[PDB]
Design a protein around this ligand. Structure first.
Ligand code: PC1
Ligand code: PC1
Ligand code: 3PE
Ligand code: 3PE
Ligand code: 3PE
Ligand code: 3PE
Ligand code: SF4
Ligand code: SF4
Ligand code: SF4
Lengths: 154, 95, 386, 318, 176, 45
């Protein structure tokens, strides 16, 4: 009953947070720190976060850089093609809320005007370690999901 | 019989792993190119002469080795001439 | 047939996003039409609403692989308009970190070029070296990338005690790392098949198309701004300018690898010739005073107050100042109207003219070659789009 | 007992493929001065399990397919054929001892391109069909040299029975008399399985906007298992062909250990090679086949027809 | 001064020609590349065990902002607005009035951490070491709103991190 | 107090290699072909 649903949630949550395949939108300088998270010192692959992931095989989108108006429709399209469950990590001030270019005529003031965001990673850029802290924070967010618990009580 | 049973198991399992993988997850709710034709055709014509070469491990047992060696080499040389003709006529180009 | 290239590869990439609209006939590329502006952020307009100090961090974020070099270009332009001179120790520090920045850029340029062509492994080896150089940035400025360290008048702070020893230990081993990279690529017949005779550009065309840096020297043009129009203390260091002979991707790759070796050679002289003294110009109407002075002397407090609110006024005038940035000639056309905010700041990004030549360079090549040609130009769209 | 025997072949294959993914990531990791999976389970031993579960509960991609029949056929053909190539392999005893086992493997592998062709045909995307046609053209091209090389080697074996390759190599590995053929065989298996530096399907689809997966996560995992089952199988076959293991009839398990070690090392060399080289251009790997391997294989096929006759080393027919 | 990176004549003597034919046919330079990746396989990796191990940082590191106090507990900030004037991103918003005891103190002190570029100009500009960038970098949030810091949040950051902040300033203030 | 700032050690730092170093290894072309051909002959025999 409730015990079986509770453990199934743990199993599927464990599988999903242990196999987070990211689609990186390397838009600007924040993408450089993202590359350093893949580099040997941090090796995001060792957490199960694969290096190369196709957008249709992805579970998390990382918005790493400034989002311009010219680019916003293309970013939304990639998000819409992501199979679920899908999560968005906003990395850096530009993606978080426009940052240094907040008052620009050509810049989206935060990617959360285009897509829902799960984690906001602050910094300009956030260090590779700060990004990794954010990814680990998303994993614990997935760990708290109770999808089957909610479904059982419907 | 054993072979057919092995074949049935392999594809039946493949059919099963595909049917449930196509159906069970649905329960969880939320400019013709001439160059490419000619590589295919060239593969076919080389494949046919490979067919004529397959019996060679059995042909080497003959008491008529003189004829067998001549015909084996003759067949492989005509393959080399076929490749040479395509090569010299730019049938293996991509530009 | 018409085809559009993807915004970026399926692995982490930090060059930005590009919409490449191509016309193909079979395997061959007949037309290339890059559609940029996907990272256009109106930097040049935003600068007009900033004081000269407030605008300096914008230059970290142009070619965001060559941060301190972009800072140097802007600092030199303002120093020229201000008619002041940074002190000798700051100039040596700027050259030292300018060449550390060149190493950072060339690792990124060479290894991501290889990574996009399919050679993934060198990217990982050399980005550990980049991580150690990020630590030098962080130890002088407190930031791994956007240091905002080089400023008009000199540098923000002096090197912490013990930093130069660590830069020596790093430099001592780096040439071995380059050798390992060359072992993987230089003589590899697959690498040579992907680069040799790809994207050839003649010396005459390279000049008329506005090319600079390695895009000129790969074609045999003997030109390097550090040699011909030296700035800071580049006239006081010895190094050789690598020159290509075929004008193709392979020669440009060899030029970048050899430039890394020359950067180590320059860093070695900087570590030994570093002079003592102050690290920013001793003119408190331009460079803020020391914090202890600001908290004790009336004049220092006033000048600190005014430099951080109004900022220094710059005499009216216009300058085009350029440096040999790792990607080529990086310049600023800076217009001062006499106030503390620049009237106009046009940024000359070397990758802008290089990318405009993609269609010319890709003629008569195949689709996979377009990836190699983009890599050999070393394009970052922060500086292209601004 | 036979149905049990089939399961003791199929199920271990799929588990090996699952854990080849872990091994590939960790071996590539250490050659890249990093670690690879070491959190999900000790030393990453639960990483394949997490990946498997994740992929099968992922939302399935909606298939905008122009042919439902060929859309479901392709993964079944790929996975069924992959499992079928294992049934004649002598390890040291085959599941099915076939007199013409080499021809069976040659004939069954020639059908593998139908899954590539049917999947692209069903994709209902011009970009997917072009990629499928490019992948087929590369596959059939390298089938040519694989067949001729295999025939040349059999002229020292005298038979199409795979178990006879064990007898042939009782004194010496066939890599000694046939290392020129071994080198071209090894590279041809890389190109046949679309492995780096011949991974043009993955390479090209990355560039082209509109050349996507078109299969849901679960069905796409079945394609991946089929591909990796083939990678292990091709390296088991390479070990049998060129590094023959001595068989003791009373201690068959001794053969299995040694032959397993060789197969693992050959499989790891595929990972070793992936970590070391850039990718070929499509026209460049076609030239490698048609203008290099094929001329050399033809000359070596002529040589290996003549050599047993001129040395008086013709193998027995049986 | 310049040098040629690729201007060499291959020798055409038979020995040299046969060295190149051996390289072509026997893949010697490809084998050499395999040697390099094999040697790396047996090298200790550079990976650290985050979050149990951390990347090294210096006292100058620019992290999360905090508002500081004097040893007596009085706020250091006297609402001069130099940080707000210099901020390149206009991330700082300040209002002030005379405090009930007559002190010059802020009634609003906001930092929009999603506008901020983490440049450290505010702490350079501050004349009384009131606003600093602390050493913390692990403060990612689940909502955008959580990154709009008001004065209470910044004072709480100061009280939370003062032990580390004070030591870092002690380490670097003679370079300023 | 004396001035104390980051400076090079007295006498400067030790030498820093920067030139390309790709050592030559292996046999000559004649030697490699001889080894390869000798292996074939033993295999054939
Ligand atoms: C098919 C069989 C599936 C086997 C399930 C394997 C679960 C292993 C596992 O959860 O690891 C322990 C995990 C590991 O804990 P963790 O993943 O939360 O964190 C481990 C510590 N770090 C991340 C810092 C390294 O324990 C759990 O968190 C509980 C989840 C249990 C899931 C199994 C459901 C039954
Ligand atoms: C080999 C191929 C087969 C592999 C198995 C893959 C298929 C597993 C079954 C998945 C469908 C289960 C249907 C559940 C229906 C349901 O309760 O609603 C979903 C509910 C939906 O929530 P909801 O009902 O509250 O609605 C959501 C809100 N709306 C509707 C508005 C969107 O929860 C889920 O979404 C998660 C369901 C996860 C199902 C987990 C099944 C048990 C664990 C599976 C382990 C798989 C092991 C794989 C082993 C390795 C591969 C062999
Ligand atoms: C006594 C008389 C007896 C008669 C017989 C005598 C024989 C004498 C001749 C012996 C030498 C024959 C060698 C045959 C091997 C094939 C050689 C070959 O094809 O190499 C050429 C090919 C292309 O090289 P390229 O530089 O482009 O040449 C210019 C072409 N226009 O280059 C390539 O193929 C390179 C392939 C690139 C991909 C390689 C990636 C992996 C490489 C490492 C694997 C090492 C091999 C491991 C073998 C394992 C076997 C189990
Ligand atoms: C150049 C780089 C290579 C790149 C290509 C990759 C090649 C990888 C090669 C992997 C296989 C190498 C051989 C593996 C060694 C394992 C040997 C073993 O386990 O058994 C011992 C064996 C000798 O015994 P045996 O093989 O049975 O010979 C009897 C003749 N029939 O063996 C004795 O030593
Ligand atoms: C030890 C005893 C012996 C000792 C003495 C040695 C004797 C043997 C060696 C002498 C043999 C003669 C050498 C013949 C090779 C030279 C042929 C040649 O030069 O062709 C090269 C060239 C193709 O090169 P490519 O760049 O691709 O295209 C042309 C662009 N210029 O031009 C072409 O267009 C090539 C077109 C023809 C290619 C022929 C392909 C034949 C197919 C392979 C058959 C191999 C033999 C039978 C199997
Ligand atoms: C594989 C494990 C790594 C081995 C270490 C690499 C190495 O030492 O080889 C380098 C050696 C020198 O070759 P190179 O520097 O390119 O100069 C031209 C030829 N002297 O080059 C060699 O000696 C490699 C010789 C390779 C021999 C051919 C292998 C054929 C495999 C099928 C048998
Ligand atoms: S937040 Fe900073 S580092 Fe990131 S893209 Fe914007 S300016 Fe660049
Ligand atoms: S660090 Fe820079 S951008 Fe952030 S609040 Fe301070 S002055 Fe403004
Ligand atoms: S934090 Fe410092 S600079 Fe800012 S208003 Fe307060 S006292 Fe002035």
């Amino acid at each position: 009953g409730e015990y079986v649903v509770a453990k199934l949630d743990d199993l599927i949550n464990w599988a999903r947070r242990s196999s987070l395949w990211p689609m990186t939108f390397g838009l600007a300088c924040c993408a450089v720190e993202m590359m350093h998270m893949a580099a040997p010192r941090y090796d995001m692959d060792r957490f199960g976060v694969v290096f190369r992931a196709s957008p249709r095989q992805s579970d998390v989108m990382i918005v790493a850089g400034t989002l311009t108006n010219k680019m916003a429709p293309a970013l939304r399209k990639v998000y819409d093609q992501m199979p679920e469950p899908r999560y968005v990590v906003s990395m850096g001030s530009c993606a978080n809320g426009g940052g240094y270019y907040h008052y620009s005529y050509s810049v989206v003031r935060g990617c959360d005007r285009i897509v829902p965001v799960d984690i906001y990673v602050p910094g300009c850029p956030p260090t590779a370690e700060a990004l990794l802290y954010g990814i680990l924070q998303l994993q614990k967010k997935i760990k708290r999901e109770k999808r089957l618990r909610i479904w059982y009580r419907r | 019989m054993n072979l057919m049973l092995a074949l049935l198991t392999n594809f039946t399992l493949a059919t099963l792993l595909v049917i449930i993988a196509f159906w069970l997850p649905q329960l969880n709710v939320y400019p013709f190119s001439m160059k490419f034709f000619l590589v295919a055709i060239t593969f076919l014509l080389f494949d046919l002469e490979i067919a004529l070469l397959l019996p060679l491990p059995w042909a080497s047992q003959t008491a008529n080795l003189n004829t067998m060696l001549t015909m084996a080499l003759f067949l492989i040389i005509l393959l080399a001439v076929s490749l040479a003709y395509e090569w010299t006529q730019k049938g293996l180009e991509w530009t | 047939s018409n085809l559009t290239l993807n915004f970026g590869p399926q692995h982490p990439a930090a060059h930005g996003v590009l919409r490449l609209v191509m016309e193909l006939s079979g395997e061959m590329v007949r037309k290339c039409d890059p559609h940029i502006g996907l990272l256009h952020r109106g930097t040049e307009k935003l600068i007009e609403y900033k004081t000269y100090l407030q605008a300096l961090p914008y230059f970290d974020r142009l070619d965001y692989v060559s941060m301190m070099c972009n800072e140097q270009a802007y600092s030199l332009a303002v120093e020229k308009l201000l008619n002041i001179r940074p002190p000798p120790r700051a100039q040596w520090i700027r050259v030292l970190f300018g060449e550390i920045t060149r190493l950072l850029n060339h690792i990124m340029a060479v290894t991501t070029h290889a990574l996009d062509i399919g050679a993934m492994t060198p990217f990982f080896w050399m980005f550990e070296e980049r991580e150690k150089m990020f630590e030098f940035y962080e130890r002088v400025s407190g930031a791994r990338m956007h240091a905002a360290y080089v400023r008009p008048g000199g540098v923000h702070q002096d090197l912490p005690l013990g930093l130069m020893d660590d830069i020596y230990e790093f430099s001592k081993n780096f040439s071995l790392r380059i050798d390992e990279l060359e072992e993987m690529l230089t003589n590899n017949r697959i690498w040579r098949n992907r680069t040799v005779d790809i994207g050839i550009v003649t010396a005459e065309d390279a000049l008329n198309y506005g090319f600079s840096g390695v895009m000129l020297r790969g074609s045999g043009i003997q030109w390097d701004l550090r040699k011909t129009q030296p700035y800071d203390v580049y006239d006081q260091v010895e190094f050789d300018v690598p020159i290509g002979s075929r004008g193709d991707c392979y020669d440009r790759y060899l030029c970048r690898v050899e430039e890394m070796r020359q950067s180590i050679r320059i860093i070695s002289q900087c570590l030994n010739k570093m002079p003592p003294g102050e690290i920013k110009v001793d003119d408190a109407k331009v460079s803020p005073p020391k914090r202890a002075e600001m908290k004790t002397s009336m004049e220092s407090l006033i000048h600190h107050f005014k430099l951080y609110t109004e900022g220094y006024q710059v005499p009216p005038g216009a300058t085009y100042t350029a440096i040999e940035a790792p990607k080529g000639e990086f310049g600023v056309y800076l217009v001062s109207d006499g106030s503390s905010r620049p009237y106009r700041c046009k940024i000359k990004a070397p990758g802008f003219a290089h990318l405009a030549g993609l269609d010319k360079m890709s003629k008569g090549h195949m689709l996979a070659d377009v990836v190699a040609i983009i890599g050999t130009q070393d394009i970052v769209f922060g500086e292209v789009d601004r | 007992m036979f149905m049990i025997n089939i399961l003791m072949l199929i199920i271990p294959i799929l588990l090996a493929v699952a854990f080849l993914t872990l091994v590939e990531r960790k071996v590539l990791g250490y050659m890249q001065l990093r670690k690879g999976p070491n959190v999900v389970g000790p030393y990453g031993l639960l990483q394949p399990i997490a990946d498997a579960i994740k992929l099968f509960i992922k939302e399935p991609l909606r298939p905008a397919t122009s042919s439902a029949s060929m859309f479901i056929l392709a993964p079944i053909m790929a996975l069924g054929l992959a499992l079928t190539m294992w049934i004649p392999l002598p390890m040291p005893y085959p599941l099915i001892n076939m007199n013409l086992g080499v021809l069976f493997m040659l004939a069954m592998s020639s059908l593998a391109v139908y899954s590539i062709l049917w999947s692209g045909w069903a994709s209902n995307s011009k970009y997917a069909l072009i990629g499928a046609l490019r992948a087929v053209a590369q596959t059939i091209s390298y089938e040519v040299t694989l067949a001729i090389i295999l025939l040349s080697v059999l002229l020292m074996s005298g038979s199409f029975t795979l178990s006879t390759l064990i007898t042939t190599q009782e004194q010496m590995w066939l890599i000694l008399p046939a290392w020129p053929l071994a080198m071209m065989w090894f590279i041809s298996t890389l190109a046949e399985t679309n492995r780096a530096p011949f991974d043009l399907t993955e390479g090209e689809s990355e560039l082209v906007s509109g050349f996507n997966v078109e299969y849901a996560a679960g069905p796409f995992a079945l394609f991946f298992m089929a591909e990796y089952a083939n990678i292990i199988m091709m390296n088991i076959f390479t070990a049998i062909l060129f590094l023959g293991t001595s068989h003791n009839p009373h201690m068959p398990e001794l053969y299995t250990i040694n032959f397993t070690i060789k197969s693992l090392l050959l499989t790891m060399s595929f990972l070793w090679i992936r970590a070391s080289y850039p990718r070929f251009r499509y026209d460049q790997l076609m030239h490698l086949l048609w203008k290099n391997f094929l001329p050399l294989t033809l000359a070596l096929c002529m040589w290996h027809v003549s050599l047993p006759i001129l040395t008086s080393g013709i193998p027995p027919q049986t | 001064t310049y040098k040629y990176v690729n201007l060499r004549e291959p020798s055409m003597d038979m020995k040299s020609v046969t060295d190149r034919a051996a390289q072509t046919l026997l893949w010697t330079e490809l084998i050499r590349g395999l040697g390099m990746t094999l040697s790396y396989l047996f090298r200790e990796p550079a990976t650290i065990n985050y979050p149990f191990e951390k990347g090294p940082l210096s006292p100058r590191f620019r992290g999360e902002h905090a508002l500081r106090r004097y040893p007596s507990g009085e706020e250091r900030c006297i609402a001069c607005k130099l940080c707000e004037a210099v901020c390149p991103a206009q991330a700082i918003t300040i209002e002030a009035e005379p405090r009930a005891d007559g002190s010059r103190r802020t009634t609003r002190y906001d930092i929009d951490m999603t506008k901020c570029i983490y440049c450290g100009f505010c702490q350079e500009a501050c004349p009384v070491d009131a606003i600093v960038e602390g050493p913390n970098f692990e403060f990612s949030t689940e909502t955008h709103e959580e990154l709009l810091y008001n004065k209470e949040k910044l004072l709480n950051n100061g009280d939370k991190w003062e032990a580390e902040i004070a030591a870092n300033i002690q380490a670097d203030y003679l370079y300023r | 107090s004396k001035v104390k700032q980051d400076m090079p050690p007295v006498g400067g730092y030790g030498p820093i290699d920067y030139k390309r170093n790709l050592p030559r290894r292996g046999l000559s072309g004649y030697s490699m072909f001889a080894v390869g051909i000798g292996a074939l002959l033993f295999g054939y025999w």
